[PDB]
From a paper:
The preinitiation complex (PIC) assembles on promoters of protein-coding genes to position RNA polymerase II (Pol II) for transcription initiation. In the yeast Saccharomyces cerevisiae, PIC assembly occurs adjacent to the +1 nucleosome that is located downstream of the core promoter. Here we present cryo-EM structures of the yeast PIC bound to promoter DNA and the +1 nucleosome located at three different positions. The general transcription factor TFIIH engages with the incoming downstream nucleosome and its translocase subunit Ssl2 (XPB in human TFIIH) drives the rotation of the +1 nucleosome leading to partial detachment of nucleosomal DNA and intimate interactions between TFIIH and the nucleosome.
We then determined cryo-EM structures of the reconstituted PIC–nucleosome complex in the absence (complex A) or presence (complex B) of nucleoside triphosphates (NTPs) under the conditions of our transcription assay. For complex A we obtained a reconstruction at an overall resolution of 3.3 Å, with local resolutions of 2.9 Å for Pol II, 3.2 Å for the nucleosome and 3.7 Å for TFIIH. The transition from complex A to complex B also led to a further detachment of nucleosomal DNA from the histone octamer. In the absence of NTPs (complex A), only one turn of terminal nucleosomal DNA (SHL–7 to SHL–6) is detached from the histone octamer surface, whereas in the presence of NTPs (complex B), two turns of nucleosomal DNA are detached (SHL–7 to SHL–5). In the structure of complex A, TFIIH contacts the +1 nucleosome only via its Tfb2-Tfb5 dimerization domain. In all three PIC–nucleosome structures, we obtained an ordered conformation of the NTT of Pol II subunit Rpb6 as confirmed by crosslinking mass spectrometry. Whereas the NTT is mobile in all previous structures of Pol II complexes, Rpb6 residues 12–35 are observed here in the active center cleft of the polymerase. Structural superposition shows that the NTT would clash with DNA and RNA in an initially transcribing complex (ITC)27, indicating its position is incompatible with transcription.
Author numbering:
A (entry chain g): 13 to 118
B (entry chain b): 21 to 102
C (entry chain h): 28 to 122
D (entry chain a): 38 to 134
E (entry chain e): 37 to 134
F (entry chain f): 23 to 102
G (entry chain d): 26 to 122
H (entry chain c): 11 to 119
The structure:
DNA sequence: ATCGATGTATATATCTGACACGTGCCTGGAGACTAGGGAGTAATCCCCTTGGCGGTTAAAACGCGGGGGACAGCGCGTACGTGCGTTTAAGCGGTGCTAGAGCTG
DNA sequence: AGCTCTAGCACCGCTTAAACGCACGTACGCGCTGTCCCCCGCGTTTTAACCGCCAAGGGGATTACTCCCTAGTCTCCAGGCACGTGTCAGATATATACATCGAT
C-alpha cells in the first residue's frame, strides 16, 4: 500500500504537488525532501488563518457561506495580515467602513 | 473608431467612487482630474496587457494577461486566476 | 490540457477543518486559490534566491524557513516557522 | 416639505457604499473607454468580458485608494472638501508623479 | 553693529549648501552605535563590516531625505512653512508605511 | 539606550536642509528619530536574518544591500 | 593565498564610456555603481523573460522574450531605441556567423 | 580549426555576449536559452550603459570634471525624467539629491 | 423637549441558481534502487574586524533675544450639496455568426 | 498547418433607474487681522568624533575528504478534477420593535 506524503506530515495541502511545482518552477536544480513539506505546512497554516478570520466575519454578518467581502474584512481588519497583502487587491472586496472624525457631525 | 468615452466616466460615478473613499465634499475640478488619473492608469495597465498579449500571438486580451499586467506594476489582483 | 489544476479541494478541507458549518463561494474559492499561488510563488522565489546567495543548488527546509522569516510578518512567522518544524518532525518520525 | 441639511445625505452614501461591494461605475461606458484606450496600441483588438471586469475593478480599487489618500491630505489641510491639489499631492507622495 | 541675518535667510543658504553636497550628514560613530544596539535585539555577539555600516547610513539618509521632501510638500500643502510631526505622519500614511 | 539620542538635532536639521526645509518644529526631531529607528528595525530584521542563513555572525555589506532590495529600495554602490 | 576570480563588468563600462566620452575618466565607486546598475537591469530583464517564458508554456528564452521584457519594464521612448538597437545586434548576429 | 572570434564582435557590441549567455544559464531562468537572447540582452545593457554614461559625462562637463563621480550619476539619472522613472526605487550611494527649491520657499522683495 | 419620518435590528413563507455531494477515469504521485555529485565536516590562515590610547578640533550643547510664522477668530459669497422633472442610455434578454482561442500532429 | 467550437461582437427592442439640468439655500474655503510663541541666528562652552596608530584574535575563506540525498528511471494505482445531480443560502416579501435627524 502507498501512503501519501501529506498524511505523513499530517497536512491537508498536497506535499507531492508542491514538490512538483517547486521542481517544474525551476527555482533550483535540486529540491530537498523536507522543503515541500515545510512549504505545504506554511501554506495550509496561512490558509487556516485567512479562512478562520473570514468565517468569523461571515458569522458576524450572519452569513453561512463565505463571500469575497468576508475575505476583504478578514485581511483588512487584521493588522498583521494587512501588510502581507497591502499591495494586493481582492476581487469584489470593497473597503473597510472607515469615516474620518472631522467629517462626522457635531 | 471610438471617440470621447472618457466622459462616460460620469459625474455621479466619480461621486460614488469618492463616497466609497470616505469623501464628504467634492470640488468641481475633481471630476476632470480623476478622469485624467483614470486615463493614465488605464493607459499604463492596458499598454502592459497588450504587450503581454502580443507575446502570445493572440488578438484577444485575456483577463489573465490583465492580471499579470497589474501584478507587474505591484498591484496584484486576486479572484481572476493566479 | 483540459485539466484545471487548483487548490480548491485543499482549501475546502482546511475550511471544513476550521469551520465545519461554513461554506465558501466559487469567487472566494478563486481568491483563495490565487492567494495560495501568490504566496507559494513569493516563498519559492525567496528560497530560490537564498539558494543562489550561498552558492547552494538545492532548496532545503532552511531555505523555506528563512524565506518565511523574511516574507511573512512577525508573530505569524513565529507561529508558522515553529508549525513548519512540527510538520518536518512528523515527516521524520513517521519516515 | 422636509429637506435634509447639506452634508448628512453624503454621510449616508459613505456608509452605504463602504458597506456594499459591487461596482460603482457603469459597465458599458468603462468598456467603451477601454476599447478607446486599447486601440492606440493595436487596432481591432478584442477583450474577454472578464478582462473588462478585472480592468474595471482594479481601476475602482486604485481610485478608491487614491480617494482615501486625497481625503486624508484634504483633512490634513483643515478642509472637508477635496481639491485637485490634494490629488497631485497624494500622487506625488505615493511616487507616481 | 555686526551684521545679523534675517531668520530664514541663512537657512536657505544652508539648504543650498547641503543639497549640492554628497557627504554623510550623520556622524559615523553615533550611527554605528545605533546600528549595533538595534542589531543586539536580534542576535547577540554580532559583528559588522565597515561597508555594511556605510550602506546602512547611506540608505537611512536617503530614506530620511525622501521623507523630508514628502513632509515638506505636505507642509506646503497645509499653507505653512514649518514641518510638523503630523506632516510626517501624513507622509508615511500616504506612502503606505503606517 | 541613549544611542538613539546620538542622532543629534543638527543631524536631523542637516537632513532637512538636504530635503529642502527652512523651518523645523521642535517635536520633529525625536519623532524623526523614532521613524529612523523603525526603518532601521526592518533592515536589521532582514540583514541579520541573511547572516542567520549564512551560519555567520558578522553582517557584511552584501547582505545589507540585498536586505534593502527586499523592501523595494535597491542600493547601488556596494555590489550586485 | 588562493582567491576567487572576482567577477564584474568593469572593463566593458570603461569601453562604452571611451566610446561615448574618450577624454572623460571615471572613479572606482562609479564602477561599483554602474556594475550594480547593469547587474540589476540584467536580473530584472532575465526574470521578466523567464516569467513570460513560463506564461506561454515555452521552455526556451528567445530574442522575442527579451524584446517583450524590454518593452514591458523599461519606460517608453528609450525602450524603442533599445529595441531597435537590440534588433540591429540580432541582424548583425544573423548576417555574420 | 577556424580563428576564435567572440560573439560580441560578431554582434558588434562591447558587452560580453558569452558572459550574458553563461549568466542566463547559471541563473536558471529557463532550461533553454536561445541563441539571439544573449545578443539582444547585451545590446540592451550596452545601450542603457551608454545612455547613462553620456548623460553623466555631460553632467561632469557642466561641473567641469573629467572624472565621473557618483554625484554625476545621480544628476544624470534624476535630471532625465525617464531614467528617473526607471530608477525611481533606487538610491545611489554618495549621490546626493537634485538642487531643487519649491516656489513659495523663495523670499519676496 | 417632541413627534414624525427614516433608516435599522429581529421573526416567518417562497424561489432559484449556485454550491455541496456523488460517479468516473487517468494521469501524476508514490514505492524501490543507484549513483554521484553536492552538502557537511575537520584543519589553516590571514585579513578583517574589534578594542584601546593620545589629541584635538569641528561639531554638538546651551542661553537668549526676537520676529515672523503658526494659530485662532470673523466676514463673506460662492461654490457645492440637495431636491425634482426629464430624458438619456445602461441593463437585460434574444439572434446570429464568425474571428479566433484552444488543441493536436 | 489543421480542425473544432466558443465566446466576442454586432444589432435590436423594452424597461426603468441613473444622469442631467436647473432652482435654491447655506457651509465652508479663503482672505484678513490679531496675538503669541517658539524656532532661528549667533555667541560661548564642552565634548566626543575622528584621525592616527597599534595589538590581537577569530572567523570567513580555502582546501581536502567523505557520505548520503535526491534526480533519475521504472511501474502501479488511487486521488483529484470534468460532469451530473439535488437541494438549500440568500434574496425577497411581509410584520414588529429601535436608534437618529430635522424643524419647531
Amino acid at each position: 500500500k502507498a501512503k501519501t506524503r501529506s498524511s505523513r506530515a499530517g497536512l491537508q495541502f498536497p506535499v507531492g504537488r508542491v514538490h512538483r511545482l517547486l521542481r517544474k518552477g525551476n527555482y533550483a536544480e535540486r529540491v530537498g525532501a523536507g522543503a515541500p513539506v515545510y512549504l505545504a505546512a506554511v501554506l495550509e497554516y496561512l490558509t487556516a488563518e485567512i479562512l478562520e478570520l473570514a468565517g468569523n466575519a461571515a458569522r458576524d454578518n450572519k452569513k453561512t457561506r463565505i463571500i469575497p467581502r468576508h475575505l476583504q474584512l478578514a485581511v483588512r481588519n487584521d493588522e498583521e495580515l494587512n501588510k502581507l497583502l497591502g499591495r494586493v487587491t481582492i476581487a469584489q472586496g470593497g473597503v473597510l467602513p472607515n469615516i474620518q472624525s472631522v467629517l462626522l457631525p457635531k | 473608431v471610438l471617440r470621447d468615452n472618457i466622459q462616460g466616466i460620469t459625474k455621479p460615478a466619480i461621486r460614488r467612487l469618492a463616497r466609497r473613499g470616505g469623501v464628504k465634499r467634492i470640488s468641481g475640478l475633481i471630476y476632470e482630474e480623476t478622469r485624467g488619473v483614470l486615463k493614465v492608469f488605464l493607459e499604463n495597465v492596458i499598454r502592459d496587457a497588450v504587450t503581454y498579449t502580443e507575446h502570445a500571438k493572440r488578438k484577444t486580451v485575456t483577463a489573465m494577461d490583465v492580471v499579470y499586467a497589474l501584478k507587474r506594476q505591484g498591484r496584484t489582483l486576486y479572484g481572476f486566476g493566479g | 490540457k483540459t485539466r484545471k489544476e487548483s487548490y480548491a479541494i485543499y482549501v475546502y478541507k482546511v475550511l471544513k477543518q476550521v469551520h465545519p458549518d461554513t461554506g465558501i463561494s466559487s469567487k472566494a474559492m478563486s481568491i483563495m486559490n490565487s492567494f495560495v499561488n501568490d504566496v507559494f510563488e513569493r516563498i519559492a522565489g525567496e528560497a530560490s534566491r537564498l539558494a543562489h546567495y550561498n552558492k547552494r543548488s538545492t532548496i532545503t527546509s532552511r531555505e523555506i524557513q528563512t524565506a518565511v522569516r523574511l516574507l511573512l510578518p512577525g508573530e505569524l512567522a513565529k507561529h508558522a516557522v515553529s508549525e513548519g518544524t512540527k510538520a518536518v518532525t512528523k515527516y521524520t518520525s513517521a519516515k | 416639505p422636509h429637506r435634509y441639511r447639506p452634508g448628512t445625505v453624503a454621510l449616508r452614501e459613505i456608509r452605504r457604499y463602504q458597506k456594499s461591494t459591487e461596482l460603482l461605475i457603469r459597465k458599458l461606458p468603462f468598456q467603451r473607454l477601454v476599447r478607446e484606450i486599447a486601440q492606440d496600441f493595436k487596432t481591432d483588438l478584442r477583450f474577454q468580458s472578464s478582462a473588462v471586469m478585472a480592468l474595471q475593478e482594479a481601476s475602482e480599487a486604485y481610485l478608491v485608494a487614491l480617494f482615501e489618500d486625497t481625503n486624508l491630505a484634504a483633512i490634513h489641510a483643515k478642509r472637508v472638501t477635496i481639491m485637485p491639489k490634494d490629488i497631485q499631492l497624494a500622487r506625488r507622495i505615493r511616487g507616481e508623479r
